[PDB]
Amino acid sequence: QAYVKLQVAAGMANPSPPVGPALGQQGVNIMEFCKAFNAKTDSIEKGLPIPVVITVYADRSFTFVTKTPPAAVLLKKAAGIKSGSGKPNKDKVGKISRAQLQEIAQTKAADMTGADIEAMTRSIEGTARSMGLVV
Amino acid sequence: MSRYQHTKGQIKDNAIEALLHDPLFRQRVEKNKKGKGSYMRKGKHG
Amino acid sequence: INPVNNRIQDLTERSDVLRGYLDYDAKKERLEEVNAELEQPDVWNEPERAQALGKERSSLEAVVDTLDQMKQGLEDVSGLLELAVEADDEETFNEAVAELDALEEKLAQLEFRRMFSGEYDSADCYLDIQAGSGGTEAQDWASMLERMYLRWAESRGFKTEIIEESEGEVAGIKSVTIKISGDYAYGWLRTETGVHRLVRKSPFDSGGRRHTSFSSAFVYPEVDDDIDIEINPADLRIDVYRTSGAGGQHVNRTESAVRITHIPTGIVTQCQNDRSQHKNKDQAMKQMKAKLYELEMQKKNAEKQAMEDNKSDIGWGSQIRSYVLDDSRIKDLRTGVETRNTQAVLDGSLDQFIEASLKAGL
RNA sequence: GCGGGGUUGAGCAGCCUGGUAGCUCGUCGGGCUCAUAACCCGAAGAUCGUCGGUUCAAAUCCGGCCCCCGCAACCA
Ligand SMILES: [Mg+2]
Ligand SMILES: [Mg+2]
Ligand SMILES: [Mg+2]
Ligand SMILES: [Mg+2]
């Protein structure tokens, strides 16, 4: 019932330019969602994007559960690099160690779909590779 | 801001150049206060 | 750290200058309103509008954001400068320096964008200098200007080349064309297009009077001469028919004459010079080709003429600088920057004027 | 289709029986003049359209290609 993941950084309260019409497409107001996001945020950290479920009921008071922050951003943070996608195999822009990746993995274990953290780590590595960085 | 009505007619190749060969950008030489073109029959207040 | 400090000091000033030229507050305001509009869901029903709006916004945002960053980065550097100095922690100092460098680079990029926005701004140019109506004095002035330009170009790094030069019979040069090769040569010089106004006591005058001579500079980019592509058989309509008068039975029967026609343009070329149809066609085809070329040239001319007319409409505003050597003050009329070191300017210190002009976008 | 041509920046030579780049102007540096012109002196400057060939050797002889200039392109 109108559930879609679509939002920018957590600290930016009330995203008017990027999301705008998308969050207030259905009957739910612009104020509420933003407020909810704000409420969510203060327990952890700002700057990073965070996705959340948007089950828009007929009553309008929607139910929601947060997800872990996206992987790509985390990877970038780990790196200390901004842009590292252009021409990956032809010339290596960035590079990361496995240990770091592993460390990164373990912190998202609640939302991550797996029991063995090894699997998670390898997924993360794969993701990193896709981006452009060689492990 | 009013348009300067140049004497070149229809400008074809280059406008600035045309203007330069125009009265607007004519040479101005000052009248000498002393020297050659310097004699004044009557003063400014004469 | 003295050089570093100096650099830091400079950078703030530079930023301020950029802001001034940009008209930053206005831009910010625009971004705001545009953003608001975007946020409103009714805008995306009209597709053409919406995309345009989006396009508008992003650039504005970039402009603002960059400026904001510039403000902050400098401050950070300053904060860390103290650490570098008194506390004497090396790594921290290094980091600060790095940040400054990065920030500086960013600033440069924005300013570069501002300056060299045009299509041909990257290309090499032909500086054309033409002396004014005066006579000898005017010629001399022109020559001086040329010299100055040459000095500038060399300083920059550009490769100068005197393509054509008409000399003055007494002194100075009547006219001169100079090819100025190098990266962003046109974009650097395009602002110098205009009339330049010298004021000085003439050495060639026997009276020794103060003369006010003018001389034009005109910078145009080396456009690539696009090849004249041949027309298609589909675009042409080809009649063939009998010829006028002539002599015989064979002539009466045969259809040697050829009338080629352009469907897009409505131009025609006939030919019936030759007996052979084929030859006539060839001739006719050639004629048609020639005509197309002429039409393309005509079009080019007309467009140019419009531009010229437009330029003329500015009139007295084509005068961009004023070199007063009696009272020793150079003034750029459009930007308003002044300097009393006239001689220096002449020698080729135009960066102060040029840069400002670029910033302005004039 | 048949001839003639492309040579310092311009206009002309040589090519005439292969090996020598000449004339007039122009350009550049000096002079004369208050200065400029004229005048005087001294210099520089040419892969001979281009590409191949024949030669010990090519502007020069032969051919191809590009461009120019003549002519001829008829008796139905
Ligand atoms: Mg000749
Ligand atoms: Mg001989
Ligand atoms: Mg020889
Ligand atoms: Mg003389």
XYZ file of C-alpha atoms (C1' of nucleotides) and ligand atoms in Angstrom, chain D residues 14-20 60, ligand 2:
9
model
C 65.233 29.065 -68.604
C 62.953 24.089 -70.413
C 65.233 24.273 -77.079
C 67.774 18.911 -76.245
C 69.486 16.934 -68.963
C 73.785 19.081 -65.497
C 74.991 27.260 -64.786
C 64.446 20.692 -68.031
Mg 70.941 23.767 -71.761
